Amino acid sequence: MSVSAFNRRWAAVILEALTRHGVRHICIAPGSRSTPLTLAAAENSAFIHHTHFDERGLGHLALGLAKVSKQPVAVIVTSGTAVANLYPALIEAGLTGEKLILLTADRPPELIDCGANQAIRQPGMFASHPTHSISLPRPTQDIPARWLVSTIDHALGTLHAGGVHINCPFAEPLYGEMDDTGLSWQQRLGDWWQDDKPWLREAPRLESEKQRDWFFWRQKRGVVVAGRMSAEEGKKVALWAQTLGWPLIGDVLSQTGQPLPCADLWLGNAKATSELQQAQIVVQLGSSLTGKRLLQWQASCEPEEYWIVDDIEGRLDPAHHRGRRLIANIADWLELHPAEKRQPWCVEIPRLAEQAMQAVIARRDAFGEAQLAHRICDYLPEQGQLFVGNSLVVALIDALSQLPAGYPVYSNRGASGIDGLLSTAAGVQRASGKPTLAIVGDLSALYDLNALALLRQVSAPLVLIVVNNNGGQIFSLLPTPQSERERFYLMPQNVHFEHAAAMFELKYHRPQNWQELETAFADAWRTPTTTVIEMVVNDTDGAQTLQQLLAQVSHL
Amino acid sequence: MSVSAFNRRWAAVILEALTRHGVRHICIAPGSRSTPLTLAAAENSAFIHHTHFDERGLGHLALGLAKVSKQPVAVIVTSGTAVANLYPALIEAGLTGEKLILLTADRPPELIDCGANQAIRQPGMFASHPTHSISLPRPTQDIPARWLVSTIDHALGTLHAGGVHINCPFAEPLYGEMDDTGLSWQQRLGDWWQDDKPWLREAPRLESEKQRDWFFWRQKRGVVVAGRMSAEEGKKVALWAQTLGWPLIGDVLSQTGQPLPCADLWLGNAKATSELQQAQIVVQLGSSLTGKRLLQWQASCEPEEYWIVDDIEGRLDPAHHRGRRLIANIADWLELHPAEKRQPWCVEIPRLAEQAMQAVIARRDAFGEAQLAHRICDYLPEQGQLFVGNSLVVALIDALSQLPAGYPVYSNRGASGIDGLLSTAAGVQRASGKPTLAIVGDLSALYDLNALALLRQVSAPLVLIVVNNNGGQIFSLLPTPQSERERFYLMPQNVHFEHAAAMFELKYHRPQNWQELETAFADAWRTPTTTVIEMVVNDTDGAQTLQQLLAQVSHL
Amino acid sequence: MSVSAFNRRWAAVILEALTRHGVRHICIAPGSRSTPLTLAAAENSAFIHHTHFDERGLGHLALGLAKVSKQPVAVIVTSGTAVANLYPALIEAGLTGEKLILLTADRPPELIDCGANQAIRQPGMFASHPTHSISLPRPTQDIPARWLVSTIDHALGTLHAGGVHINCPFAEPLYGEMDDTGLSWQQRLGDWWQDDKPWLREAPRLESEKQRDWFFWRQKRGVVVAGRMSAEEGKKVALWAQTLGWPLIGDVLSQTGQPLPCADLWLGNAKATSELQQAQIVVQLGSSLTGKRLLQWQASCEPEEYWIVDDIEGRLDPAHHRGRRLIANIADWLELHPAEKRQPWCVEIPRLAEQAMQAVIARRDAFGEAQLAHRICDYLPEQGQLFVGNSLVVALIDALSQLPAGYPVYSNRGASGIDGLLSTAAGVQRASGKPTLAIVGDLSALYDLNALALLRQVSAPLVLIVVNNNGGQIFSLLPTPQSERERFYLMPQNVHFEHAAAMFELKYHRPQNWQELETAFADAWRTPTTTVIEMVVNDTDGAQTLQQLLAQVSHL
Ligand SMILES: Cc1ncc(C[n+]2c([C@@H](O)CCC(=O)O)sc(CCOP(=O)(O)OP(=O)(O)O)c2C)c(N)n1
Ligand SMILES: Cc1ncc(C[n+]2c([C@@H](O)CCC(=O)O)sc(CCOP(=O)(O)OP(=O)(O)O)c2C)c(N)n1
Ligand SMILES: Cc1ncc(C[n+]2c([C@@H](O)CCC(=O)O)sc(CCOP(=O)(O)OP(=O)(O)O)c2C)c(N)n1
Ligand SMILES: Cc1ncc(C[n+]2c([C@@H](O)CCC(=O)O)sc(CCOP(=O)(O)OP(=O)(O)O)c2C)c(N)n1
Ligand SMILES: [Mg+2]
Ligand SMILES: [Mg+2]
Ligand SMILES: [Mg+2]
C-alpha cells in the first residue's frame, strides 16, 4: 500500500496518455510536489525534456515550442505561485491557438485552506483562459485507470487550439522505492500500454462550410488583407490575390512578400483610401493585424461584405463588419475558393506603394532603429526564421520593410506582451532547429532577462538584437503628455547588456555603424550559439522618423 | 434623449437578431424590468408568444418546444429569482442539446449589491451549464449596434447545442412615450433590417471524420445499441443493424421498433450475456440509455472497441471503454459508414427476446402500471407522439413494451428530473401541433401541478395519464431500507387529481378497468383539449411485477 | 471494506457536526444518491425532519423555518436538477441572512461529464450566492475524520448570514447492511461524539465600533427610518425615536407601531418632504424598505449624513448617500448609541399623517383588497404572526394599515419573489408553533400551489388569504402599455382555489362580504389546520384605490 508508488503510477498514465496525442516536448520546472509528474516524464522515452527555473519563462518556452512545431507541448510545475507564473503564456496561447498542456501539481484536498505551506486554491485559477480545465481528484485505486486516460483523451482529442489546465493533486509521501502498488490497476488498460493510439479517440473537426456564392463574389472589386499565417500560406495567398487582380495588403506577420509594401504609410494617403472605397468585398486571411493605418482603414471601410478566414475561433473583426467569420485552414480554404484570372482594378495604389518604399529608401543611411527595421531583410539568416518583438520593432518592420515571401516570421501578437519574448524565442529556435534572428526592445529584454540562461542552449546560431533606445519609446510615438512621459511612460532604465551577456557566457557586440553591424552578424552566424547584438540609438529617432515618413507619404 | 425608448431599441436589435437564427417560439414571464425585451418581442411578427407565471415551468415549456421544433427557443424573464427558476431546464438542455436562449432582464450595475429590491448578481449565476454566456453591458449609444448584433450572431452561430445565457441590464425609466432616441443608432445597420440572414455569419460545423477502417469492422461480430435519437434515425438504424446481421438493443427512446424487445429482462439471462461476450465491436448510436440491465451489460462488456455515435459532444460512455466517440448526425454517419449484407451471428438472443416478450404477455390482464406500460402501444394516437415521464414509467415501458419504429418519443432523460414533465409535454404538443399521449407518476404530477394551466391550451388532443401508486415507488424497486422507506423515500402524499383537473377545467376520468380506460381515450381524442386520466394502482405491484419478470426471464 | 457503510459513516460525521452549531430542523426531499445523508439524518435524534417532493418548496420551507427560528436549517437533496431547484431560496437567504445548509448529494467524480444519468456539474453551480461553498472530495478513509469535521466547523462557525453549499459526492453501492467499516476512522474523534461543542470553534464576530460623535449627531434634526427587523427591535426603535423627538417612518416590516402611519401616502405631500429637507441626518435601522414613496424620498433626500444600521453586511442604500454603513444587532446598537430627551422638531408631518389615516378610514367600507389591507389588524390572531406576500398586498398593507408594535411580521423581501410564499409560510408556522395569518396574491398562490401539501401539517391554525384579482395587478399599478398589458403583464389565469383546497382537504371559504369573512376567520381559528380564504375582488380596484388615496393625501 505505498502511496508514493501509486502516485507515480497515476502520473505515469497521465504522461503516457499525452504521448498518444503528439506531445513530444515537455518543459519542467523544479519542485517537490510535482515529483510524480516529473519522474513519470523523466522515465518516458517519448519526450524531449526542457528545464528552466522561471516558470513564467518556462510557459513562454513551451509557447515557442508549440508555436513553431504546431504540436501540443506539455508543462510540469509544482504547486503554488509556480502555477500562477504560467498565466501569461496560457493567455497568449488562448489568443493565438498554441496547445499548452499544463500539468500543475497540487496539494491534496486535505491541505487546502488550512495554512499549509505552499498550498493554494488551484482549480479554476486560470478562469476562462484555458480551452479545457481538468481538476483531477485525489489519486485512488478506486477510480479506474480507464477513467483517467479517458479524461485526458477527451481533453486532448477535442482541443481545437489553446491551453489545457490539468490540476494534479498528490498526497505525501512522495518519495520511496517503487513497489507493485497500482501495477494491476495500470494493467487493466491491457495492451494499450504497447499501442500508439488514444484509449478514447474523440477528434471532431471544427470547420466552416465552403461558401457557394464565392464564384459570384470573386467577380467583384475586392481587397485581400493578409494577417498572421504560416509561411507557405503566405506564398499561396500572394499568388491567389495576384490571380484575382485584387490589391494585397500584407502584414509583417504574413509571409506574402508584400507586393504593395509600406502600407502603413500609403494607407495614410487620401488617394489610396479613396481608391479602396470602391471595394465591394474585403477578404482577410489571418488576423492580429499589426499596422495602425491598416486598423484605421479596416475600421473605416464599408464593403458589402467583410470575410475573415482563419483557423482561430471567435470574432476577429474589431470593427464588427457585416460579413462572414470562416474557420478553416487557410491553404485548404484557398483550394476550396480558388482564384480565376481577372484584370486588376487598382491603378493608383501600386504607384503610391512604390513611391512610399522609395521615400523610406531615401532615408536608409542613418544608424537608427527605423533604418534597422527597413534594412532587416538584408540580415535574415539563410534558411532561418525571424522572431519579432513587440512595441516599436514590429511596427517599424511592418511600416518600413518588405520581407520576402515564405520567409518564416514568429511573434507574440495575441496579447502583445513584452513579458516573455526571450524565452519564447528560445522555444521558437529549439523547435525548428533553424538559425534565428530575434529583435526586441530594451525594456522587453530586461523583462525576460533571466531567459538568457535558456539561450545558452540553442541548436543553431541565434542572434538577439536588443535595440536600446533607453525606455519604451512607443510612448514617444503615442501622444502621451510630455510632463509625465519620462517618469510614467518611457521609464528609462539606463543600462547596457554587455554584463548580462558576459554573465551567461554569450558573445556580445555593440556595433556603432553599419560596417560593424555586418561584421558582428558575419561572426555570429558561425557557431550554434546565441550572440547578443546591442544597437544603441538616440531615444526618439525611430518614432520621429516614422512620423515624418507618414506625413511625407500622406502628401503624395 | 429618452432612456426608455433607447432601452427598447437595444432590446429590439437583440430580438430581431435572434430571428435570423431560426428563433420562432418565445416564452415570456411577467415582470417590469423585462419590459424592453417583452415589448420588443410583442411587436416582432416573427415570434409565437407563449406565457406562463411559473418561470421553472416556463423554462421546461421552452425545453419541450425546442425539443420538438429542433430550433433555438427564446425565453424572457424579469430580474431576481425568476432567473434562478430557469436553472433546471437550462441544465437539462445542457445535457440533451436543446437550444434555449435565456434573455434575463437585470438591474443596471449601479443597483447591484446595494440593497435594491429584486436586484441580485446575475452574470455567471448559471456557472458552466450554458454553452455560451453573454453579460451585456449597460445600454449606451456609445456602443455601436453592429457590436451588439455581432455578439448575438457569434453566440447563436457557433451554438452546436445547449443553452445561451444572455444577461440584459436595463436602467429606468422603463416606460414612457417612444421617441426617436436610438433611431439613427439602429439605422447604422442599413438594410440588415430588411434582410433574412445574420449580420455576421459565423457557423463552423463540428463533426468527426470518416472512420477509414470501417470496412474492416463492419465484417466483425458487432452489437448495435440504439439510445435516444430521432424517429427517422431510429428507422435508419434499424435497417442498418439488420443489414449488418448484428443484434440491435433498442432503447424506448430509439424508435427503432425494438426488434429484440424486453432487453431489460433477457439481458439478465446468462445465455444472452455469454453470447454477447463474443462481440468484437459495439457501435452505439444515441445515448442516455434507459434500462438498468442494459447499463450493467455495457459496464461489464469488454469488446475490442466501443463506439458511440451521436450529435452531442463529450464523453457519453459511463464505463469509459477503450474505443471511439464520434460526433455526427446519425443519418449522415450511417450514410458515411454503410452496412453490407452479412448473415446474423446471434443464435440464442432472438429466441430469448421472444420468450421474454411471451413472459410479459402472460401477465397482461391485471389492471396495473406494469400492464399499462406493456400495453401502451394500444393507446398511442395515430400520427401522434408519446411523451414519457421519469421514474418507473420509462423503465416499465422500456422493459415491457415494444414501441413501433419511427413513432416519436420525447422525454427528459438528461438529468431525469421529475420537476418539469407536464410543462415540457405542453411545449412538445404546442410545437408539433400533434395529438399527444403523456405519461407521468403521481409525485411528478404534483411537482409540476400548476403546469395544468398551460395544458388548458393545446392545439390537438393531449391525454395525460397520471399513474398514482401513492409515492415514488421506484424506491420500492431499489433496495432501500424498510424502516425509513415510507417517510424518507416513498413520501406518499395521499391525494387524487380530480380536483386538480376541475380547477383548470379539464376533463377527468378515473378508470377501474380496461374497458373504462378505452372509453376515456375514445372521449379524449375527440377534441383539441387536455384530458387527465388518473390510474390508481396498488403501490408496489408494478415494481414487484418487474422483479418477478426479471427473475423468470433470468431462468429461461 | 464496504463502500456503502463508509458512505454512511462519512455522512454521519457531517450531520453530527451540524448539530453542534444549532441545526435542529432538517428538510429532506426524496432520492437514491442522497441515501447516506438521509439515513444519517434519520438515525440522528437531534433533528426534526420535514419532507417534501418539490425541492424549490423544500428550500423555501427551510427558509421560513430559519427565518423564524434564527437557527441554521439544513436541507438534503439528491443529485441533479433537484440541486438546482434550491437556487431561489438560497438567493433570498443571501439577501436577508437566513442560514441554510444545503447538503446536495453528488455522483462521484468518475461519473461526471460522461453521459451518466442524473449526473451534472454541481461544485460552484450556485456561483457567488452562497456565503461559503464546500466541494467535499470523494469519500475515503485516507482523509481523516478531523479534516471533514474541521471543514464543516469552519464553514458554520464563520457564517455571519446566508447559505452554505456542501456538495457531497458518493459512489455506489449506496445500500447494504452496516458493518464495522469506518468505525475506527470515526473513533479517531474520541469523545467528541459525546460532546456538545464543535471540533473546531472558530466564531469571530463581525461588528462596527461605537460612533464617537453620536452625542454630536443626537442634537441635530434627524429622521428615523425603520425597515425590516425583529419584533422586539421594532418596539425599542419606536421608543428611541420618540425619546429623540425625531419623526419615525415605520415600514410594514418594522413592527414599530408606525406612529406616523400611511407614510406611503403623506410622503407624497410637498409640505412633508419640504419639512423633511430640514433633516441634517437620517438614521435608518433595518433595510429592504417597502414603499415607493419612501424609496423616492430616500433617493431624493440630501442629509449631511445617512446611516444604515443592520446586522446584514454590505451596502444597503440604493441611493448611495454620503454617510455610514453600521453592522450591528439593532438592539445592541441602540444601547451603544442611546437617545436623549429632545423636543420633536416636526410640526406638519404628524397632522398630515393623521389626515392620511382618516382619508383611508373614509374608504374602509367597500369589500376590496385595499380595504382588506387597511383593516388587516382586525384579523391578526392573538399571540400569532403575520406572513405577508409580495406584489400588491405588502404595498397596500404598508401604505394603508397601521400594524401593532411588536406584532411579528415575516416576508420574503430580499429578492421579493412570488415563487415560494406558501412553502415559506408553512416553515414560518412550524418554526414558532404560532397561529399564522398569511396573505398572498392569486399568481403567487398558483406559483407555489403544490405547497398546499405542506400546509396539511401545521401545529397551530393557519389562515391563508388568497386575494384573487385575476392576474398580477401590480402591473395595473405601474404605467405598462395598454394593448400589451393583459397578455404580457397581467396574465390572468381565470381560476378559483376551491378545488385546490379540496384536493389537499383544506377548509375553504369564499366570503362575499365582511360578515362572511369574519365568520370564516372564527371557523378557522378553532383547529390547528390550514383554512384557505379566497377573496375575489375586481381586477384594478385595489391599485386604483391606492392611486386615488395617494392623489388626495398629496393635495392636503
Ligand atoms: C515560484 C516557485 N516555483 C517553484 C518553487 C519550488 N521550490 C522550493 C520550495 O519552496 C518548495 C519545494 C516544492 O514543494 O516544490 S525551493 C526551490 C529551489 C530554490 O533554489 P535556491 O534559490 O537556489 O535556494 P536553495 O534551494 O536553498 O539552494 C524551488 C524551485 C517555489 N518555492 N516557488
Ligand atoms: C507585459 C506587458 N506590460 C506592459 C505592456 C505595455 N507596453 C507596450 C505596448 O503594449 C503599449 C500599449 C498599451 O500598453 O496599452 S509597449 C511597451 C514598452 C516596451 O519598451 P521596449 O521594449 O523598450 O520597446 P520600445 O517601445 O520600442 O522602445 C510597454 C511596457 C506590454 N506590452 N506588455
Ligand atoms: C427533480 C427531481 N428530484 C428528485 C429526483 C429523484 N427521484 C427519482 C429518480 O429520477 C432519481 C433517483 C435517485 O434519487 O437517485 S424518482 C423519484 C420518485 C418519482 O415519483 P413518481 O413521479 O410518483 O414516479 P414513481 O417513482 O414511478 O412512483 C424521485 C424523487 C428526480 N428524478 N428529480
Ligand atoms: C419568481 C418571480 N417571478 C416574477 C416576479 C415579478 N412579479 C412581481 C414583482 O415585480 C413584484 C414583487 C414585489 O415587490 O412584491 S409581481 C408579480 C405578479 C404577482 O401577481 P399576484 O400574486 O396576483 O399579486 P398582485 O400583483 O397583487 O395581483 C410578478 C409576476 C417575481 N416577483 N418573482
Ligand atoms: Mg526601448
Ligand atoms: Mg408514484
Ligand atoms: Mg393577483
PDB file of N, CA, C and O and ligand atoms in Angstrom, chain A residues 369 390-393 396 413 415-421 440-447 467-475 478 489-490 539, ligand 2:
ATOM      1  N   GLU A 369      17.092  52.813 -35.407  1.00  0.00           N
ATOM      2  CA  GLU A 369      16.204  51.654 -35.387  1.00  0.00           C
ATOM      3  C   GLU A 369      15.216  51.654 -36.551  1.00  0.00           C
ATOM      4  O   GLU A 369      14.811  50.575 -37.005  1.00  0.00           O
ATOM      5  N   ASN A 390       7.777  42.947 -29.602  1.00  0.00           N
ATOM      6  CA  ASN A 390       6.615  43.817 -29.581  1.00  0.00           C
ATOM      7  C   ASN A 390       7.069  45.272 -29.448  1.00  0.00           C
ATOM      8  O   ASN A 390       8.266  45.573 -29.466  1.00  0.00           O
ATOM      9  N   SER A 391       6.102  46.178 -29.298  1.00  0.00           N
ATOM     10  CA  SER A 391       6.304  47.635 -29.252  1.00  0.00           C
ATOM     11  C   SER A 391       6.829  48.102 -30.612  1.00  0.00           C
ATOM     12  O   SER A 391       6.271  47.691 -31.637  1.00  0.00           O
ATOM     13  N   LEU A 392       7.863  48.954 -30.677  1.00  0.00           N
ATOM     14  CA  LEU A 392       8.205  49.652 -31.918  1.00  0.00           C
ATOM     15  C   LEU A 392       8.784  48.729 -32.983  1.00  0.00           C
ATOM     16  O   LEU A 392       8.651  49.024 -34.169  1.00  0.00           O
ATOM     17  N   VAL A 393       9.495  47.659 -32.608  1.00  0.00           N
ATOM     18  CA  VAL A 393      10.201  46.894 -33.640  1.00  0.00           C
ATOM     19  C   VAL A 393       9.215  46.304 -34.647  1.00  0.00           C
ATOM     20  O   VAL A 393       9.411  46.398 -35.864  1.00  0.00           O
ATOM     21  N   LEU A 396       7.764  49.139 -36.820  1.00  0.00           N
ATOM     22  CA  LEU A 396       8.683  49.702 -37.802  1.00  0.00           C
ATOM     23  C   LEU A 396       8.977  48.710 -38.920  1.00  0.00           C
ATOM     24  O   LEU A 396       8.946  49.081 -40.098  1.00  0.00           O
ATOM     25  N   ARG A 413       1.849  38.088 -30.787  1.00  0.00           N
ATOM     26  CA  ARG A 413       0.962  39.178 -31.173  1.00  0.00           C
ATOM     27  C   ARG A 413      -0.495  38.897 -30.850  1.00  0.00           C
ATOM     28  O   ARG A 413      -1.376  39.500 -31.464  1.00  0.00           O
ATOM     29  N   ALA A 415      -1.778  38.872 -27.285  1.00  0.00           N
ATOM     30  CA  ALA A 415      -1.852  39.942 -26.310  1.00  0.00           C
ATOM     31  C   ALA A 415      -0.680  40.922 -26.410  1.00  0.00           C
ATOM     32  O   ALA A 415      -0.689  41.961 -25.737  1.00  0.00           O
ATOM     33  N   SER A 416       0.326  40.609 -27.215  1.00  0.00           N
ATOM     34  CA  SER A 416       1.438  41.520 -27.479  1.00  0.00           C
ATOM     35  C   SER A 416       2.203  41.859 -26.202  1.00  0.00           C
ATOM     36  O   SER A 416       2.728  42.966 -26.051  1.00  0.00           O
ATOM     37  N   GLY A 417       2.337  40.875 -25.316  1.00  0.00           N
ATOM     38  CA  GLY A 417       3.076  41.091 -24.086  1.00  0.00           C
ATOM     39  C   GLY A 417       4.569  41.218 -24.328  1.00  0.00           C
ATOM     40  O   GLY A 417       5.150  40.585 -25.222  1.00  0.00           O
ATOM     41  N   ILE A 418       5.200  42.068 -23.520  1.00  0.00           N
ATOM     42  CA  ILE A 418       6.649  42.196 -23.519  1.00  0.00           C
ATOM     43  C   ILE A 418       7.279  41.338 -22.420  1.00  0.00           C
ATOM     44  O   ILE A 418       8.442  41.535 -22.071  1.00  0.00           O
ATOM     45  N   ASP A 419       6.534  40.368 -21.879  1.00  0.00           N
ATOM     46  CA  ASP A 419       6.999  39.657 -20.690  1.00  0.00           C
ATOM     47  C   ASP A 419       7.648  38.311 -20.974  1.00  0.00           C
ATOM     48  O   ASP A 419       8.260  37.740 -20.062  1.00  0.00           O
ATOM     49  N   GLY A 420       7.578  37.796 -22.198  1.00  0.00           N
ATOM     50  CA  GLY A 420       8.198  36.505 -22.442  1.00  0.00           C
ATOM     51  C   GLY A 420       8.889  36.332 -23.777  1.00  0.00           C
ATOM     52  O   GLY A 420       8.935  35.222 -24.310  1.00  0.00           O
ATOM     53  N   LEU A 421       9.470  37.404 -24.319  1.00  0.00           N
ATOM     54  CA  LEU A 421       9.930  37.335 -25.705  1.00  0.00           C
ATOM     55  C   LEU A 421      11.243  36.557 -25.843  1.00  0.00           C
ATOM     56  O   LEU A 421      11.460  35.880 -26.857  1.00  0.00           O
ATOM     57  N   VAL A 440      14.283  42.627 -30.200  1.00  0.00           N
ATOM     58  CA  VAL A 440      13.440  43.117 -29.117  1.00  0.00           C
ATOM     59  C   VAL A 440      13.959  44.458 -28.622  1.00  0.00           C
ATOM     60  O   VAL A 440      15.108  44.843 -28.864  1.00  0.00           O
ATOM     61  N   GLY A 441      13.082  45.158 -27.860  1.00  0.00           N
ATOM     62  CA  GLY A 441      13.450  46.404 -27.230  1.00  0.00           C
ATOM     63  C   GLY A 441      14.140  46.205 -25.892  1.00  0.00           C
ATOM     64  O   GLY A 441      14.212  45.100 -25.339  1.00  0.00           O
ATOM     65  N   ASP A 442      14.640  47.316 -25.350  1.00  0.00           N
ATOM     66  CA  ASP A 442      15.445  47.232 -24.135  1.00  0.00           C
ATOM     67  C   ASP A 442      14.603  46.811 -22.935  1.00  0.00           C
ATOM     68  O   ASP A 442      15.003  45.919 -22.170  1.00  0.00           O
ATOM     69  N   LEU A 443      13.421  47.419 -22.760  1.00  0.00           N
ATOM     70  CA  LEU A 443      12.553  47.025 -21.639  1.00  0.00           C
ATOM     71  C   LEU A 443      12.080  45.589 -21.783  1.00  0.00           C
ATOM     72  O   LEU A 443      11.900  44.892 -20.779  1.00  0.00           O
ATOM     73  N   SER A 444      11.830  45.148 -23.022  1.00  0.00           N
ATOM     74  CA  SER A 444      11.495  43.750 -23.270  1.00  0.00           C
ATOM     75  C   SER A 444      12.623  42.819 -22.854  1.00  0.00           C
ATOM     76  O   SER A 444      12.378  41.776 -22.240  1.00  0.00           O
ATOM     77  N   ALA A 445      13.862  43.161 -23.197  1.00  0.00           N
ATOM     78  CA  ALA A 445      14.980  42.312 -22.816  1.00  0.00           C
ATOM     79  C   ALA A 445      15.170  42.293 -21.304  1.00  0.00           C
ATOM     80  O   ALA A 445      15.482  41.242 -20.731  1.00  0.00           O
ATOM     81  N   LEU A 446      14.992  43.442 -20.638  1.00  0.00           N
ATOM     82  CA  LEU A 446      15.083  43.469 -19.174  1.00  0.00           C
ATOM     83  C   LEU A 446      13.992  42.616 -18.550  1.00  0.00           C
ATOM     84  O   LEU A 446      14.226  41.921 -17.557  1.00  0.00           O
ATOM     85  N   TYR A 447      12.787  42.678 -19.111  1.00  0.00           N
ATOM     86  CA  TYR A 447      11.659  41.951 -18.552  1.00  0.00           C
ATOM     87  C   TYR A 447      11.957  40.462 -18.458  1.00  0.00           C
ATOM     88  O   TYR A 447      11.708  39.832 -17.426  1.00  0.00           O
ATOM     89  N   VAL A 467      17.550  46.470 -29.285  1.00  0.00           N
ATOM     90  CA  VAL A 467      17.561  47.877 -29.663  1.00  0.00           C
ATOM     91  C   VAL A 467      17.424  48.674 -28.369  1.00  0.00           C
ATOM     92  O   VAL A 467      16.391  48.621 -27.698  1.00  0.00           O
ATOM     93  N   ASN A 468      18.468  49.407 -28.001  1.00  0.00           N
ATOM     94  CA  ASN A 468      18.484  50.108 -26.721  1.00  0.00           C
ATOM     95  C   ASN A 468      18.230  51.575 -27.033  1.00  0.00           C
ATOM     96  O   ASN A 468      19.143  52.318 -27.405  1.00  0.00           O
ATOM     97  N   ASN A 469      16.966  51.974 -26.895  1.00  0.00           N
ATOM     98  CA  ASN A 469      16.534  53.359 -27.003  1.00  0.00           C
ATOM     99  C   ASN A 469      16.192  53.948 -25.646  1.00  0.00           C
ATOM    100  O   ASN A 469      15.452  54.934 -25.577  1.00  0.00           O
ATOM    101  N   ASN A 470      16.652  53.310 -24.572  1.00  0.00           N
ATOM    102  CA  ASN A 470      16.523  53.809 -23.202  1.00  0.00           C
ATOM    103  C   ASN A 470      15.053  54.080 -22.855  1.00  0.00           C
ATOM    104  O   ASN A 470      14.641  55.213 -22.592  1.00  0.00           O
ATOM    105  N   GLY A 471      14.261  53.004 -22.858  1.00  0.00           N
ATOM    106  CA  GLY A 471      12.884  53.085 -22.428  1.00  0.00           C
ATOM    107  C   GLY A 471      11.930  52.517 -23.454  1.00  0.00           C
ATOM    108  O   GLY A 471      12.327  51.911 -24.459  1.00  0.00           O
ATOM    109  N   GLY A 472      10.638  52.675 -23.171  1.00  0.00           N
ATOM    110  CA  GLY A 472       9.620  52.261 -24.106  1.00  0.00           C
ATOM    111  C   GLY A 472       9.231  53.396 -25.032  1.00  0.00           C
ATOM    112  O   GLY A 472       8.268  54.117 -24.762  1.00  0.00           O
ATOM    113  N   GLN A 473       9.966  53.572 -26.124  1.00  0.00           N
ATOM    114  CA  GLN A 473       9.784  54.753 -26.950  1.00  0.00           C
ATOM    115  C   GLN A 473       8.541  54.684 -27.826  1.00  0.00           C
ATOM    116  O   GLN A 473       8.247  55.650 -28.532  1.00  0.00           O
ATOM    117  N   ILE A 474       7.777  53.596 -27.773  1.00  0.00           N
ATOM    118  CA  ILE A 474       6.442  53.634 -28.352  1.00  0.00           C
ATOM    119  C   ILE A 474       5.618  54.749 -27.707  1.00  0.00           C
ATOM    120  O   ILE A 474       4.745  55.346 -28.357  1.00  0.00           O
ATOM    121  N   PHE A 475       5.901  55.074 -26.434  1.00  0.00           N
ATOM    122  CA  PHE A 475       5.203  56.152 -25.747  1.00  0.00           C
ATOM    123  C   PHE A 475       5.749  57.529 -26.102  1.00  0.00           C
ATOM    124  O   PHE A 475       5.225  58.531 -25.604  1.00  0.00           O
ATOM    125  N   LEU A 478       3.194  57.490 -29.343  1.00  0.00           N
ATOM    126  CA  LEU A 478       1.857  57.815 -28.885  1.00  0.00           C
ATOM    127  C   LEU A 478       1.846  59.241 -28.343  1.00  0.00           C
ATOM    128  O   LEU A 478       2.885  59.765 -27.940  1.00  0.00           O
ATOM    129  N   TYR A 489       5.853  56.763 -18.427  1.00  0.00           N
ATOM    130  CA  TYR A 489       5.680  56.034 -19.682  1.00  0.00           C
ATOM    131  C   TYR A 489       6.999  55.439 -20.158  1.00  0.00           C
ATOM    132  O   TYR A 489       7.148  54.212 -20.151  1.00  0.00           O
ATOM    133  N   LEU A 490       7.968  56.264 -20.550  1.00  0.00           N
ATOM    134  CA  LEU A 490       9.192  55.729 -21.132  1.00  0.00           C
ATOM    135  C   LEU A 490       9.927  54.843 -20.134  1.00  0.00           C
ATOM    136  O   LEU A 490      10.422  53.768 -20.492  1.00  0.00           O
ATOM    137  N   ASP A 539      17.019  58.092 -28.365  1.00  0.00           N
ATOM    138  CA  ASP A 539      15.712  57.671 -27.872  1.00  0.00           C
ATOM    139  C   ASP A 539      14.582  57.821 -28.882  1.00  0.00           C
ATOM    140  O   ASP A 539      13.912  56.843 -29.216  1.00  0.00           O
TER     141      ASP A 539
HETATM  142  C1  LIG D   2       3.645  42.617 -20.143  1.00  0.00           C
HETATM  143  C2  LIG D   2       3.385  43.984 -20.732  1.00  0.00           C
HETATM  144  N1  LIG D   2       3.246  45.064 -19.937  1.00  0.00           N
HETATM  145  C3  LIG D   2       3.054  46.231 -20.443  1.00  0.00           C
HETATM  146  C4  LIG D   2       2.969  46.405 -21.787  1.00  0.00           C
HETATM  147  C5  LIG D   2       2.714  47.800 -22.351  1.00  0.00           C
HETATM  148  N2  LIG D   2       3.708  48.223 -23.272  1.00  0.00           N
HETATM  149  C6  LIG D   2       3.681  48.435 -24.663  1.00  0.00           C
HETATM  150  C7  LIG D   2       2.522  48.370 -25.614  1.00  0.00           C
HETATM  151  O1  LIG D   2       1.948  47.204 -25.432  1.00  0.00           O
HETATM  152  C8  LIG D   2       1.742  49.603 -25.143  1.00  0.00           C
HETATM  153  C9  LIG D   2       0.261  49.841 -25.306  1.00  0.00           C
HETATM  154  C10 LIG D   2      -0.554  49.670 -24.018  1.00  0.00           C
HETATM  155  O2  LIG D   2       0.079  49.434 -23.026  1.00  0.00           O
HETATM  156  O3  LIG D   2      -1.798  49.745 -23.962  1.00  0.00           O
HETATM  157  S1  LIG D   2       4.977  48.824 -25.186  1.00  0.00           S
HETATM  158  C11 LIG D   2       5.847  48.955 -24.019  1.00  0.00           C
HETATM  159  C12 LIG D   2       7.296  49.400 -24.000  1.00  0.00           C
HETATM  160  C13 LIG D   2       8.270  48.394 -24.450  1.00  0.00           C
HETATM  161  O4  LIG D   2       9.501  49.003 -24.343  1.00  0.00           O
HETATM  162  P1  LIG D   2      10.748  48.478 -25.180  1.00  0.00           P
HETATM  163  O5  LIG D   2      10.952  47.127 -25.134  1.00  0.00           O
HETATM  164  O6  LIG D   2      11.870  49.172 -24.702  1.00  0.00           O
HETATM  165  O7  LIG D   2      10.459  48.869 -26.672  1.00  0.00           O
HETATM  166  P2  LIG D   2      10.103  50.246 -27.355  1.00  0.00           P
HETATM  167  O8  LIG D   2       8.825  50.730 -27.030  1.00  0.00           O
HETATM  168  O9  LIG D   2      10.262  50.049 -28.650  1.00  0.00           O
HETATM  169  O10 LIG D   2      11.011  51.258 -27.098  1.00  0.00           O
HETATM  170  C14 LIG D   2       5.108  48.570 -22.835  1.00  0.00           C
HETATM  171  C15 LIG D   2       5.578  48.492 -21.410  1.00  0.00           C
HETATM  172  C16 LIG D   2       3.092  45.272 -22.586  1.00  0.00           C
HETATM  173  N3  LIG D   2       3.007  45.325 -23.968  1.00  0.00           N
HETATM  174  N4  LIG D   2       3.301  44.108 -22.075  1.00  0.00           N
END
